[PDB]
């Protein structure tokens, strides 16, 4: 009765995890380049409705999180953010938005979704071009921290809730290192962090895009992986 891990979620199953009132993660699992990786993304309720904070990474996993949602909660997701580009955030935006759920994320997320043969939200969400940058949708506010994990990479918080959603600019406390740096910028991360620790310190809980939920330490911890990471690499 803990937060799921890696294995325990076969491929193909979606868990939700109740974070605070209205407000819960979701869990899936995916094989890439050969291993198997958990992913969290958010759910978070908006009157009688719900926002969605990531696909589950991929159309199947997708599916079976919109019937996850309808079985647990029963509200409709009527709008979903993306908050990067990769796979894991985007795949099952074509599923979502043939099931009615307007897709959303910022336009340099939609141009480099299409430029990697990813599957691409309909709705750009400006505002968010400069770091430091926030915006308000519904029960959120979306932040642009600077470039880290990916140039693109948004952060979500739920102001009722001190929820912080770091996505995969975030690690978790077990992590060793900054992972798959292909779209990374390793000199700006260290940074982009700093912006986020500034920017919500009331934060009680902190959601990485993979693996378990903590405190604010997280965030630390995280500028200091990709710091270790990157001396490693020099
Ligand atoms: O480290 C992470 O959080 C992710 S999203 C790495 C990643 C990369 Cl860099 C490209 C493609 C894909 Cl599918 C993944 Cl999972
Ligand atoms: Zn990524
Ligand atoms: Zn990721």
């Given at each position: 009765?803990?937060?799921?891990?890696?294995?325990?979620?076969?491929?193909?199953?979606?868990?939700?995890?109740?974070?605070?009132?209205?407000?819960?993660?979701?869990?899936?699992?995916?094989?890439?380049?050969?291993?198997?990786?958990?992913?969290?993304?958010?759910?978070?309720?908006?009157?009688?409705?719900?926002?969605?904070?990531?696909?589950?990474?991929?159309?199947?996993?997708?599916?079976?999180?919109?019937?996850?949602?309808?079985?647990?909660?029963?509200?409709?997701?009527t709008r979903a953010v993306s908050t990067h580009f990769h796979d894991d955030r985007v795949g099952g935006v074509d599923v979502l938005r043939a099931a009615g759920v307007a897709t959303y994320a910022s336009p340099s997320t939609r141009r480099l979704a299409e430029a990697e043969g990813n599957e691409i939200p309909t709705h750009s969400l400006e505002g968010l071009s400069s770091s430091g940058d926030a915006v308000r949708f519904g029960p959120?506010?979306?932040?642009?921290?600077?470039?880290?994990?990916?140039?693109?990479?948004?952060?979500?918080?739920?102001?009722?809730?001190?929820?912080?959603?770091?996505?995969?600019?975030?690690?978790?406390?077990?992590?060793?290192?900054?992972?798959?740096?292909?779209?990374?910028?390793?000199?700006?991360?260290?940074?982009?962090?700093?912006?986020?620790?500034?920017?919500?310190?009331?934060?009680?809980?902190?959601?990485?895009?993979?693996?378990?939920?903590?405190?604010?330490?997280?965030?630390?911890?995280?500028?200091?992986?990709?710091?270790?990471?990157?001396?490693?690499?020099?």
């Amino acid at each position: 009765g803990e937060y799921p891990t890696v294995n325990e979620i076969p491929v193909g199953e979606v868990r939700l995890y109740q974070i605070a009132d209205g407000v819960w993660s979701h869990i899936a699992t995916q094989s890439f380049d050969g291993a198997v990786y958990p992913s969290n993304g958010l759910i978070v309720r908006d009157g009688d409705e719900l926002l969605l904070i990531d696909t589950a990474w991929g159309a199947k996993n997708t599916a079976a999180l919109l019937a996850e949602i309808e079985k647990q909660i029963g509200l409709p997701v009527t709008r979903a953010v993306s908050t990067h580009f990769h796979d894991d955030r985007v795949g099952g935006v074509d599923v979502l938005r043939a099931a009615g759920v307007a897709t959303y994320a910022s336009p340099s997320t939609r141009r480099l979704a299409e430029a990697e043969g990813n599957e691409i939200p309909t709705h750009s969400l400006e505002g968010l071009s400069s770091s430091g940058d926030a915006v308000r949708f519904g029960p959120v506010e979306l932040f642009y921290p600077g470039a880290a994990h990916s140039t693109d990479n948004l952060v979500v918080y739920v102001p009722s809730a001190n929820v912080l959603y770091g996505g995969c600019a975030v690690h978790e406390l077990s992590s060793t290192s900054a992972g798959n740096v292909a779209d990374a910028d390793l000199a700006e991360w260290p940074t982009s962090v700093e912006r986020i620790q500034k920017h919500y310190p009331e934060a009680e809980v902190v959601i990485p895009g993979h693996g378990l939920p903590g405190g604010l330490d997280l965030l630390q911890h995280t500028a200091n992986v990709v710091k270790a990471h990157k001396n490693r690499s020099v």
